[PDB]
Each structure stands twice: as structure tokens, then as C-alpha cells.
């Protein structure tokens, strides 16, 4: 029996930028979700389509762990039915989402005096993302009537913008690490079970 490697997901030195959000599939293992949701490390632990207390009694085909960094004020956008730059252009959950959203303050890891500019988000997009879609393209965004032809200027914007993360920001502008666990059911044997 293998224990699910949630530790590797939650403890990675660096997290993905939200526009290029990282995904791991978790399979063929036993997961104790009580160890997770009974941790005081998390400032957000919200489950959708399941009661978190039955999770240790369920089996799924696979579990997915998507992870990335956003600012605190944006954590509310990681839920089904939300709107906003993050939910619309970076990471979208479906309305029938079955899974848990887990977030914690990462000011000590991801901010620096001077600003950590390595974490980015998509500011502009011609249409909303589909659920679980990822957009890693870097085309100049044509905000007005004139085609941009690769050149930046007014109404012609590079679509990705950097977070500013500094440790002295208020909590709304501090980095939060987010892990979204999705529970998948396919026409196949279950491979991830509670204890």
C-alpha cells in the first residue's frame, strides 16, 4: 500500500504561476484527508460536491492536485460560479466541481523585499476559459480596433502581468499558495481510497 504523496504537492519549494498552473495526478494510493483538513496550517479549506468528513470513506478513480499562487483577495475566485480575472482568464472550476480548495498564506516563501516578480497572472483574454482549461499563450492582446502585429503600445498589451509580491503588503496583496484537489470518477477501477 502506498500513501498518497500530498506532501510533495503542498511542500514544493516553488509553486506555478496561476496562468501556467501546475497539475499532478495522484493514483494507486491511500489518502487520509483528515490529516489535511485537521491541519491548522490552512486559511482556506472548502469542499464542493462532497462532505469533507465522508472523504475517508470514498474511493475515486484518481485525484488531481492543481497548484499555483494568487494574492489573498483572489482566493475567493477559486470556487465554482465565480467571476473575476482569475476565475475568467487563469483558472476556472466547473459548476459540477467535486473537490476541495485549500489555500495558505505564503508571504514568508514567495514575497521578497524589492518585490518577487516571478509570479504572473493573465490580465486580458478575448474570452473566458473553459473549466480546467489552461492558456499559456503570450500573444499581444488587442484591446482596441487596431491590430497589434506583435508590437506593444496603447490598446496593445502584453497579456501577463506580474504580482508585486513584497512581504510588507497588506494581506489582500500577499501571496497565497492554492491546491485544488479534484476527485475523478471514470468507467475504470478506483485507485485512490480513504483508510
Amino acid at each position, epitope marked *: 500500500t502506498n500513501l498518497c504523496p500530498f506532501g510533495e504537492v503542498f511542500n514544493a519549494t516553488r509553486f506555478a504561476s496561476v496562468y501556467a498552473w501546475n*497539475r*499532478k*495526478r495522484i*493514483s494507486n494510493c491511500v489518502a487520509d484527508y483528515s490529516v489535511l483538513y485537521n491541519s491548522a496550517s490552512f486559511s482556506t479549506f472548502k469542499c464542493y460536491g462532497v462532505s469533507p468528513t465522508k472523504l475517508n470513506d470514498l474511493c475515486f*478513480t*484518481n485525484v*488531481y492536485a492543481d497548484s499555483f499562487v494568487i494574492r489573498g483577495d483572489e482566493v475567493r475566485q477559486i470556487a465554482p460560479g465565480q467571476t473575476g480575472k482569475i476565475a475568467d482568464y487563469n483558472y476556472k472550476l*466547473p459548476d459540477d466541481f467535486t473537490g476541495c480548495v485549500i489555500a495558505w498564506n505564503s508571504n514568508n516563501l514567495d514575497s521578497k523585499v524589492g518585490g518577487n516578480y516571478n509570479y504572473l497572472y493573465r490580465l486580458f483574454r478575448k474570452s473566458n476559459l*473553459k*473549466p*480546467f*482549461e*489552461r*492558456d*499559456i*499563450s*503570450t*500573444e499581444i492582446y*488587442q484591446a482596441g480596433s487596431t*491590430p497589434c502585429n*506583435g508590437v506593444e503600445g496603447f490598446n496593445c498589451y502584453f497579456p501577463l502581468q506580474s504580482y508585486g509580491f513584497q512581504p510588507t503588503n497588506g494581506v489582500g496583496y500577499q501571496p497565497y499558495r492554492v491546491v485544488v484537489l*479534484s476527485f*475523478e470518477l*471514470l*468507467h*475504470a477501477p478506483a485507485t485512490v481510497c480513504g483508510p
Partner: antibody, heavy 127, light 112 residues
Framework: QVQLVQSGAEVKKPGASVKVSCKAS????????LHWVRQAPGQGLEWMGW????????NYAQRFQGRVTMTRDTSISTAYMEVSRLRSDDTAVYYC????????????????????WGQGTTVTVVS | QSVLTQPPSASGTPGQRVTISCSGS????????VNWYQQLPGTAPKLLIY???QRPSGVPDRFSGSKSGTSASLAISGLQSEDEADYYC????????????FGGGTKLTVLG
């Protein structure tokens, strides 16, 4: 290195079936979907379908629904495509290609392209 | 099923910029990302561009991709003779079951 190695050239009579194989190495076989694409002599690429080696689920192009079966054997990291009721214009090169997005959710699949290609298998259908 | 429309041929000289268009519909390019393949005579296609404008490792920077609305374009900025090849665009089409649609392909000749 990541690679897909296909089985050799096949010559079949009309109405027969053919089964072509595609062995994956250099990565974890179940992490990525596999696509099958064919190309008739002097013509363009034509998608045949995808298989998810993690579940065995498939999505066939409607033109081949009922005539093509894709399968896999994860113990030996190999995908198979069987085409039945062969016609002369099934004569073509058959590619398997790796879906380039790791860890798709099958019920929320997103196609971003195919990054690793087999060398191709010719199938010739003649009496 | 649907088709993606490419010109049957294109050409340019070395040092010139050549563009190849790819026209689709709201259910494929209008909804999904565009990827491009290069096929040299007698060999398997090779991924050139994905996610509208991303280059796989090993693809030189003179290849670029764009998308707007229901169409897309491949640019080769500074043709080299080894770029003589067939080029295909492709995209998911959400119609019915969902399926990959390929362009009809474009033969590029390099007049060098």
C-alpha cells in the same frame, strides 16, 4: 528520450483487418493520451481518435466509429489500433502521437497538440 | 466533419517573411487553441507551434503563431532552405463527440 516506436509495414487484402502497435518509452505511459492519425499517399493528415491509456477510454472520429478499435497494454507500455473491413483507400501511413498535455481529466479533456510522433506504419490494402 | 482551410501553397525567398493562414469556425479555432506541424518529405510530422504561439524546445525562434477569432496564422520570419516542407494547422472541434480537425496542409517552397 521520449519516443514512440510503431510496428512494421502491413499488406492486407480488402475486407481483412489489421492491428498496428505503438510502444512508448522514456516517460510514464499512462500520463498522456495517445492519438492516431493517418495520411493517404499525397494527401493530408486525418485524425482517427484518442485513447487514454490510464482508463482505456476512447474517442473515435465519427468516420471510423464501428470500424476502429484502440486498446492498450500498460504492462508493456503499448497502444494498439485495429482497423477492420479494410478498403483500398485505407492505404495510408498510420501514426500514433502523444497528446502533449500531461494528466488530462477525461471528462474535462483539452487538446493542445501532439508533441511526440511515432515513425509511422504503412498499411497497403490490395488484392 | 469540419475542415480547416489553408492555402494549398506558399513561397518566399530566404530572408523573407512568409505567413500561412488557417481558417476555421466558432466550434474549433473560435473555441480552442491552434497547433501547427511541419512535415518534411518522407518523414513524420513534427510539432511546430502549440497553444496558439508557443514553440516546443528545439523549434527555432523564426517560427511564430497567432490566432484571432476563428482564424490563425503561422509566420516564418527569415526563410531558410530547410523550411521547404508541408505545414498543417490543427485544432479541437467541440462539435458532436469533439474531434481533432487538421488543415488541408500547405506546401511551402523556398526559392533560394
Amino acid at each position: 528520450q521520449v519516443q514512440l516506436v510503431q510496428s512494421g509495414a502491413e499488406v492486407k487484402k480488402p475486407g481483412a483487418s489489421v492491428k498496428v502497435s505503438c510502444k512508448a518509452s522514456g516517460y510514464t505511459f499512462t500520463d498522456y493520451f495517445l492519438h492516431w492519425v493517418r495520411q493517404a499517399p499525397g494527401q493530408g493528415l486525418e485524425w482517427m481518435g484518442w485513447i487514454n491509456p490510464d482508463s482505456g477510454g476512447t474517442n473515435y472520429a465519427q468516420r471510423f466509429q464501428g470500424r476502429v478499435t484502440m486498446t492498450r497494454d500498460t504492462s508493456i507500455s503499448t497502444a494498439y489500433m485495429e482497423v477492420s473491413r479494410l478498403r483500398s483507400d485505407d492505404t495510408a501511413v498510420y501514426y500514433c502521437a502523444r497528446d502533449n498535455e500531461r494528466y488530462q481529466m477525461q471528462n474535462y479533456y483539452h487538446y493542445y497538440g501532439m508533441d511526440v510522433w511515432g515513425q509511422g506504419t504503412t498499411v497497403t490494402v490490395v488484392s | 466533419q469540419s475542415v480547416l482551410t489553408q492555402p494549398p501553397s506558399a513561397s518566399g525567398t530566404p530572408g523573407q517573411r512568409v505567413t500561412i493562414s488557417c481558417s476555421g469556425s466558432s466550434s474549433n479555432i473560435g473555441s480552442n487553441t491552434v497547433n501547427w506541424y511541419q512535415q518534411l518529405p518522407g518523414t513524420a510530422p513534427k510539432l511546430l507551434i502549440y497553444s496558439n504561439n508557443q514553440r516546443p524546445s528545439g523549434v527555432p525562434d523564426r517560427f511564430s503563431g497567432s490566432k484571432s477569432g476563428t482564424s490563425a496564422s503561422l509566420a516564418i520570419s527569415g526563410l531558410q532552405s530547410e523550411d521547404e516542407a508541408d505545414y498543417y494547422c490543427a485544432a479541437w472541434d467541440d462539435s458532436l463527440n469533439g474531434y481533432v480537425v487538421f488543415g488541408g496542409g500547405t506546401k511551402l517552397t523556398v526559392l533560394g
